[PDB]
Amino acid sequence: GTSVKPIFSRDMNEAKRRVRELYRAWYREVPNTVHLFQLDISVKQGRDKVREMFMKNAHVTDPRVVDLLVIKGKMELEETINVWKQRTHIMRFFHETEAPRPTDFLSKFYVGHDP
Amino acid sequence: GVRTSPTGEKVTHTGQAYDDGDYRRVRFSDRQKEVNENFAIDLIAEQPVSEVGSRVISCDGGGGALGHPRVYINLDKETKTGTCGYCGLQFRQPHH
Amino acid sequence: KLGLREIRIHLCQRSPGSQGVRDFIEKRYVELKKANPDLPILIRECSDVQPKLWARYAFGQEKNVSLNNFSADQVTRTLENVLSGKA
Amino acid sequence: DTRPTIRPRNDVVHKQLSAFGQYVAEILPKYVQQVQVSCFNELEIFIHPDGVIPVLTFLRDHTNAQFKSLADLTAVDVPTRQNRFEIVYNLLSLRFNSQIRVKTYTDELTPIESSVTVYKAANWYEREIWDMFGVFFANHPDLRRILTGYGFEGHPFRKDFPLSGYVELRYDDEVKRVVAEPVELAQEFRKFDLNSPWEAFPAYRQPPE
Amino acid sequence: FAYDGLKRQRLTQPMIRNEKGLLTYTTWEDALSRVAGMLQSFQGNDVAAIAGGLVDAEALVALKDLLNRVDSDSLCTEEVFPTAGAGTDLRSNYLLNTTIAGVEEADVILLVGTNPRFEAPLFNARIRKSWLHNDLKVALIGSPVD
Amino acid sequence: LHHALIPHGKGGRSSVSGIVATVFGATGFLGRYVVNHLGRMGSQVIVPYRCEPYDTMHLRPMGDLGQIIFMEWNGKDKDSIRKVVEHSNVVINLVGREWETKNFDFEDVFVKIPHAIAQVSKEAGVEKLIHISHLNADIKSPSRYLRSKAVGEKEVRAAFPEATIIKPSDIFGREDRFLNYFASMRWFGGVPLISLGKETVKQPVYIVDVSKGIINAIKDPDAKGKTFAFVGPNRYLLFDLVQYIFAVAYRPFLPYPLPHFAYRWVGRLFEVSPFEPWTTRDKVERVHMSDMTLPHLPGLEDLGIQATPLELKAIEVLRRHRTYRWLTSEMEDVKPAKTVNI
């Protein structure tokens, strides 16, 4: 009941190990994306975005979930390596054309009827 | 009949005409507001009301399969003329 | 001036924890309203509610006070300091 | 004929398929949970998810089964079930010209042994179930998106996923690029609520609960 | 047949009084700034709110808190209910305590100064339903009505 | 607001914004970019044009279907301007030309045409008119471009008192004729700076910054009547600016001092061409004026937009000019040109 099958890791520490090596691969990769993909964002401007993507889902605690996003990040790295993603596909991570959205309640009330 | 709004825009049979202070009229300049001159509201009016000599009458719209589903109109009220709900043709009892 | 703007007693109908509060509102309330016939003492009850006392002061300030498992005398005492602690 | 519109019913095929269903149930009682033959003579075997590799192999190698062609491998998502994902294997036996269905269940975060070793045709199919639904297949030679665009976020065929998605594409001249933006349809999909409030088939009437 | 009422004579954009006292359309910022300034300047008992009839409960508590923070306890309502004695203090003083569904159980009903046919049509329907089967006896103290 | 100008949606393509606008001269540089932003938020643009409609093709795919509408207009025809600005909230004037054509001098495209636009916009009943000038606009500047821009500013202010006047300093972008100009100067031997270009200070502003500033000024309810000055964040010495331009392009740099009158003769010789005049006397002059600092005038930061330094957005402009050799070098390879402090 409370105990179920594992995906890859058998504890949170091994999942964190996999997250660590995935971050290793991404951090090593980033300048290769900047050069090969002819990107115009600075190298650090991609490494911090990798950091932010890792920090986004930093709240999850179910191990199987952690292995799942480890595989998904591995797949995205796989696409980025052998030029399977393109310039537009990579640039989607930096939401450029999107106008900045407001966070305070007052501006949301001024702009439209949404939560 | 198609008539002209004060702005200059022709009103359609649905009574549609953009307001003077409406930016949408920009789409119609150097073009024309596509409207249908043959108004169904008028065109059905002058069709003569048939003097049917029976209490009820069946209308199919003419042409059998070419027309509308056949419906039966009850011509009993002398104050009004039975009108088919599909094609708008009227019928009336011969002065009852 | 915190002239004791409003009292809100939120007691449960059936649970024993609010039992004492019930006793208070059964007996020691008519004379309470007779004492100060301007106070909006609110006795809005609800099912499955821990008995509590809210004392809305002036300028929109509130201090909730729990009345869990209190006695009738206990609730009386815990309210008299509230309406006597204001000038 | 007395039934010019009703589709003819074959009962000999029903008996043969029922006999083979009992055969398979007796052969592998460890995994075969429930076997049933539909009214139109199609046999379905519901097995435990651990029996994916064994049962298939049996159906592929036994002299009396000889199912040597994975016709189709798909999944059906039923959110109201605990293990919503329901993986379906369709197999065809060319020697006994017969089609079989092996159906297993799996939730979002439970892996399934890849049947690539048994049926090498499954290799692409599995990826599709991963891409469309999100069922992860362990021991797979290469699991990747096969249909969705690169960098896609989500599993489209899941029921809890809008048919219009969340992101549309556009070309922006400011960045000179095919950018992605939040979806915004000119005309929203008009959801039609077409369902007769009168019970259709008395045969499939769920008992009250 | 009142949904059409929510298609005519609607207020869509904020209005403010111009130099002739004429109502004119304005952005939310300007009207909110005017109201905020007037609330900031005038405080105490000179601030008040007469709640309507179709208002919700969230807006009522929001207005109550807003006017309380300016020390204004003059929250009034269009309807008048006797505040003498217990008043709003006891809930049962202003509640149909035995519910609408309880009407189908009572045997004698005494309506005082009311026309439930129009004031509460569903309540009158419930009274009639109890009148049919349970043979409940009604008695009116108000003016004779249908 | 009218019943159809009430803002609706979430800022996407198919969202009613209420910024129904006319952008004269949209077919070029910022005229494109502004439309893009106007197209992005969902505003009905009444883009007028005089060129071949094919040249307006790149204007088509930045607005939701039905939003962008193209109309024929002529500068010397009040009826055309009245037709294009009859139903519009804002009229943005972007008409300009770095040279003087046979049928249009500097005064025609910077005084006469802006005068007609402002007068017709006021007659029609528009609420905002954003006119665009140059930061180095002076009635006594030797270049007729800046002098005509100054008199045009005065005329536009007279005709439309509440017209927002924006004075960008120097637009650099993918098609800018300012960085591409210096990059293309490699063909004619070396780069011939006047007095080695060690006395001119230039403050270039990013194109996206200017277009976003225009959009914000439209949305800002206080931009009426004001006169903004859109400048970059740093002030570059002209020699150092060309150094940076040729370093990012990795082309060899061959500075060469050149007497002023000889460069005027070169500008005349290039003006002779019956096609796109690569360089004019006005052009060789303007590259030698410094950017007049005007701290009193409000800037981009007041509108809420942070100027992007040229270093970050220089690789976009000059990556095309690089040969196959340095075609893939990163953005941080070349160190920012030293800037004189503001």
Place this chain on the structure above:
Amino acid sequence: ILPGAAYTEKSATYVNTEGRAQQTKVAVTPPGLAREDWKIIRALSEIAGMTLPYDTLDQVRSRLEEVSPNLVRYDDVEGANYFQQANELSKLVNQQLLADPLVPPQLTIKDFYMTDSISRASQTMAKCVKAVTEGIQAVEEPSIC
């Protein structure tokens, strides 16, 4: 004339005459620039400086629970008690009844229709009061279709 939202254009709590507190859900968004009422009040409080604590609909419902816990028990009749105390407090004023008869404000069908703002602004209730007032001649139409 800060425009508010209507009952069909908001998710809000209404209490019937029996004490049951139900909630209406959003079906259409407010027309034009109109917004939710609680949002309007909260934004006004923020502008004026005395910002209210609640910033979301769930927060406002929590505040409603704080003021009255029976305003969140949706579709639950919370029976009140203590009729004796209310009666005892009532027998102190000794206010004297008048001689004017108890005449309900609405005594005919004509008064039922146009009561509230929405009903008054509507047109079908106008046709209804017309039908009931003069007679049967105001409701003739071609109902054949």
Place this chain on the structure above:
Amino acid sequence: TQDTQLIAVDEKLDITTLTGVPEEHIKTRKVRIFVPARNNMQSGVNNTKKWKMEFDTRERWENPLMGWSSTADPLSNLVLTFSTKEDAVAFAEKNGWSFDVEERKVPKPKSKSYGANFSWNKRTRVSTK
């Protein structure tokens, strides 16, 4: 059951990061578990036997060109079905969506009798057929 070093994962299941749903559309929405009410136009109850989960209605504006019902809420026409309330709330918590479940209303069993139409002492006697 599953002999692969079967691990205890007691903490509650959450796939909010494995669905691709953006930031906005995962807490600011409020799903609604409810048994659909019978269409009072009809008299059939076959549509009131399955629980349904739906998302709050958002802005729906008019397209300037033709007048369509333009919207920017992807989860507007998506309504899930569920056999039981518990399964629906399990799905809601699993995907991290705020809910407000309404209990299933059931028609109270009435007491019909043809004879009461022609009663002798009671008021249920009908005046017409």
